[PDB]
Design an enzyme around this catalytic site. Structure first.
Site, mmCIF file in Angstrom:
data_model
loop_
_atom_site.group_PDB
_atom_site.id
_atom_site.type_symbol
_atom_site.label_atom_id
_atom_site.label_comp_id
_atom_site.label_asym_id
_atom_site.label_seq_id
_atom_site.Cartn_x
_atom_site.Cartn_y
_atom_site.Cartn_z
ATOM 1 N N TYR A 86 0.844 -1.186 0.000
ATOM 2 C CA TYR A 86 0.000 0.000 0.000
ATOM 3 C C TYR A 86 0.881 1.237 0.000
ATOM 4 C CZ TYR A 86 -3.729 -3.227 0.623
ATOM 5 O OH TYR A 86 -4.590 -4.282 0.401
ATOM 6 N N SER A 87 0.628 2.127 -0.952
ATOM 7 C CA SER A 87 1.319 3.403 -0.995
ATOM 8 C C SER A 87 1.069 4.177 0.285
ATOM 9 C CB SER A 87 0.778 4.239 -2.143
ATOM 10 O OG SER A 87 0.848 3.563 -3.373
ATOM 11 N N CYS A 267 0.145 7.573 -10.592
ATOM 12 C CA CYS A 267 -0.122 6.590 -9.557
ATOM 13 C C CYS A 267 -1.606 6.263 -9.536
ATOM 14 C CB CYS A 267 0.341 7.118 -8.198
ATOM 15 S SG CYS A 267 0.412 5.877 -6.890
ATOM 16 N N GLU A 307 4.025 4.538 -10.765
ATOM 17 C CA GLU A 307 3.773 3.399 -9.885
ATOM 18 C C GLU A 307 2.283 3.097 -9.953
ATOM 19 O OE1 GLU A 307 4.979 3.036 -5.507
ATOM 20 O OE2 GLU A 307 6.121 1.547 -6.637
ATOM 21 N N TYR A 309 -0.862 -0.131 -10.393
ATOM 22 C CA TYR A 309 -1.072 -1.428 -9.767
ATOM 23 C C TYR A 309 -2.471 -1.978 -10.005
ATOM 24 C CZ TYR A 309 -2.601 2.139 -6.451
ATOM 25 O OH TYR A 309 -3.201 3.232 -5.879
HETATM 26 C C1 LIG Z 1 3.517 -0.703 -5.170
HETATM 27 C C2 LIG Z 1 2.054 -0.955 -4.914
HETATM 28 C C3 LIG Z 1 1.297 0.016 -4.269
HETATM 29 C C4 LIG Z 1 -0.054 -0.187 -4.023
HETATM 30 C C5 LIG Z 1 -0.667 -1.384 -4.423
HETATM 31 C C6 LIG Z 1 0.090 -2.354 -5.067
HETATM 32 C C7 LIG Z 1 1.444 -2.151 -5.317
HETATM 33 C C8 LIG Z 1 2.237 -3.222 -6.021
HETATM 34 N N1 LIG Z 1 -2.046 -1.576 -4.139
HETATM 35 C C9 LIG Z 1 -2.695 -2.879 -4.373
HETATM 36 C C10 LIG Z 1 -2.616 -3.761 -3.127
HETATM 37 O O1 LIG Z 1 -1.281 -4.228 -2.944
HETATM 38 C C11 LIG Z 1 -3.511 -4.996 -3.286
HETATM 39 O O2 LIG Z 1 -3.159 -5.734 -4.451
HETATM 40 C C12 LIG Z 1 -5.012 -4.702 -3.306
HETATM 41 O O3 LIG Z 1 -5.364 -3.968 -2.133
HETATM 42 C C13 LIG Z 1 -5.822 -5.981 -3.371
HETATM 43 O O4 LIG Z 1 -5.362 -6.862 -2.322
HETATM 44 P P1 LIG Z 1 -6.379 -7.761 -1.499
HETATM 45 O O5 LIG Z 1 -5.611 -8.581 -0.540
HETATM 46 O O6 LIG Z 1 -7.517 -6.943 -1.016
HETATM 47 O O7 LIG Z 1 -6.953 -8.709 -2.640
HETATM 48 P P2 LIG Z 1 -6.546 -10.219 -2.958
HETATM 49 O O8 LIG Z 1 -5.117 -10.221 -3.325
HETATM 50 O O9 LIG Z 1 -7.028 -11.115 -1.883
HETATM 51 O O10 LIG Z 1 -7.405 -10.510 -4.257
HETATM 52 C C14 LIG Z 1 -7.130 -9.787 -5.475
HETATM 53 C C15 LIG Z 1 -8.411 -9.534 -6.231
HETATM 54 O O11 LIG Z 1 -8.971 -10.790 -6.675
HETATM 55 C C16 LIG Z 1 -10.357 -10.774 -6.416
HETATM 56 N N2 LIG Z 1 -10.807 -12.150 -6.298
HETATM 57 C C17 LIG Z 1 -10.375 -13.090 -5.400
HETATM 58 N N3 LIG Z 1 -10.867 -14.287 -5.601
HETATM 59 C C18 LIG Z 1 -11.684 -14.124 -6.710
HETATM 60 C C19 LIG Z 1 -12.481 -15.024 -7.443
HETATM 61 N N4 LIG Z 1 -12.573 -16.328 -7.168
HETATM 62 N N5 LIG Z 1 -13.162 -14.540 -8.504
HETATM 63 C C20 LIG Z 1 -13.044 -13.244 -8.808
HETATM 64 N N6 LIG Z 1 -12.322 -12.303 -8.193
HETATM 65 C C21 LIG Z 1 -11.659 -12.811 -7.147
HETATM 66 C C22 LIG Z 1 -10.511 -9.935 -5.155
HETATM 67 O O12 LIG Z 1 -11.828 -9.415 -5.005
HETATM 68 C C23 LIG Z 1 -9.515 -8.814 -5.451
HETATM 69 O O13 LIG Z 1 -10.098 -7.789 -6.249
HETATM 70 C C24 LIG Z 1 -2.739 -0.540 -3.549
HETATM 71 N N7 LIG Z 1 -4.077 -0.701 -3.321
HETATM 72 C C25 LIG Z 1 -4.823 0.249 -2.669
HETATM 73 O O14 LIG Z 1 -6.019 0.091 -2.429
HETATM 74 N N8 LIG Z 1 -4.148 1.378 -2.288
HETATM 75 C C26 LIG Z 1 -2.808 1.647 -2.502
HETATM 76 O O15 LIG Z 1 -2.324 2.708 -2.121
HETATM 77 C C27 LIG Z 1 -2.113 0.622 -3.166
HETATM 78 N N9 LIG Z 1 -0.796 0.811 -3.398
#
Ligand SMILES: Cc1cc2c(cc1C)N(C[C@H](O)[C@H](O)[C@H](O)COP(=O)(O)OP(=O)(O)OC[C@H]1O[C@@H](n3cnc4c(N)ncnc43)[C@H](O)[C@@H]1O)c1[nH]c(=O)[nH]c(=O)c1N2
Length: 309
Positions: A86-87, A267, A307, A309
């Site tokens: 998370y950023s 972003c 950045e 995602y």
């Molecule tokens: C560098 C960087 C920075 C950030 C982020 C990523 C990265 C790489 N993210 C994203 C964050 O890391 C994360 O990937 C998301 O919050 C989703 O994570 P979860 O654990 O909630 O979903 P999880 O990883 O558990 O699932 C991923 C997705 O799959 C879906 N899913 C799961 N099973 C399913 C199924 N059977 N059928 C259909 N869909 C299904 C879920 O509903 C979800 O949308 C982010 N995010 C954010 O909100 N704010 C931020 O500031 C950032 N910043």
């Protein structure tokens, strides 16, 4: 005036912290607060999460925290869940101005069947719901910090920084802008131009709007702020209004700033980028420029920071 922040020894480090805590031994942080950032017409919930790291997990603006949500890894029995990044949406001093807390800007990932809309708790995003469901006193397994792509270049305190956000992508910019404008940081006195563009679905989906609007009144010669509301506004070509369309309203000013050395940042969700590239290509073409050559030069000059995602 600018808000007193402490402790100023957070300015002493010459390099950003990286991987201070690792997934096998995270730091157990404590939730301070969780609040929705959005109004009733927003298509989904985005929350502001304040986390007490005790000063044990310091960071620089633009970095990310890892969070390990509870439970078993569904793909690896007996193993912890994977880190979600998370950023960080706060400055290094945090929302309490004390160097003890950091904040996240988290979109709740909720599943709806594409035909019926029916929910399914087993398909919800594990860590986004975990965070948005958190309450004061809850414990969080925190890792990191990590990331260098979105560090703020401070060598020139009069630089220009063009910040392009969609949704939660506003997070690093909230931190940049508090450091530039809100906090009393004697060794970083920003006198350039910071220009925030924010695309969201509608007015109820705006994030931190009162804070950004306040900067327009406090620093009218150093801050600009433009918003695109996709479900409530339309571009000149009748599509939904996206952040790339707002940029185009200022095409000449923006290209001149880039040519003058401005940094530009992107972003948010990775789906924001194709439309932005398309708009920038068309703007360049209308000016008689090659966007490919311009982007190559911006990357070579270290002006281009993404950045998504
Ligand atoms: C560098 C960087 C920075 C950030 C982020 C990523 C990265 C790489 N993210 C994203 C964050 O890391 C994360 O990937 C998301 O919050 C989703 O994570 P979860 O654990 O909630 O979903 P999880 O990883 O558990 O699932 C991923 C997705 O799959 C879906 N899913 C799961 N099973 C399913 C199924 N059977 N059928 C259909 N869909 C299904 C879920 O509903 C979800 O949308 C982010 N995010 C954010 O909100 N704010 C931020 O500031 C950032 N910043």
């Amino acid at each position: 005036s600018k808000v007193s922040v402490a402790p100023l020894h957070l300015e002493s480090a010459k390099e950003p912290p990286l991987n201070t805590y690792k997934p096998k031994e995270p730091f157990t942080a404590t939730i301070v607060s969780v609040e929705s950032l959005v109004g009733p017409k927003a298509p989904g919930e985005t929350c502001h999460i304040v986390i007490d790291h005790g000063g044990n997990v310091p960071y620089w603006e633009g970095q990310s925290y890892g969070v390990i949500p509870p439970g078993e890894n569904p793909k690896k029995p007996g193993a912890p869940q994977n880190v979600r990044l998370y950023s960080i949406a706060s400055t290094r001093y945090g929302d309490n101005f004390d160097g003890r807390t950091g904040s996240l800007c988290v979109r709740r990932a909720v599943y709806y069947d594409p035909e019926t809309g029916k929910e399914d708790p087993s398909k919800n995003g594990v860590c986004s719901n975990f965070l948005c469901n958190s309450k004061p006193g809850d414990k969080i397994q925190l890792t990191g910090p990590s990331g260098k792509i979105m560090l703020l270049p401070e060598e020139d305190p009069n630089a220009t920084h063009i910040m392009i956000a969609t949704g939660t992508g506003v997070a690093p910019f909230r931190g940049y802008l508090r450091r530039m404008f809100m906090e009393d940081v004697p060794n970083y006195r920003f006198g350039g131009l910071a220009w925030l563009f924010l695309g969201v679905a509608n007015s109820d989906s705006l994030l931190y709007d009162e804070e950004f609007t306040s900067y327009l009144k406090q620093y009218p010669d150093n801050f600009r702020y433009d918003k695109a509301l996709s479900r409530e506004q339309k571009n000149r070509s009748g599509g939904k209004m996206y952040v790339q369309d707002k940029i185009e309203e200022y095409s000449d000013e923006i290209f001149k700033l880039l040519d003058g050395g401005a940094h530009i940042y992107f972003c948010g969700l990775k789906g924001m980028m194709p439309g932005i590239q398309d708009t920038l290509k068309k703007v360049a073409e209308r000016r008689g420029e090659s966007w490919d050559q311009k982007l190559a030069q911006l990357k070579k000059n270290k002006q281009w920071h993404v950045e998504v995602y």
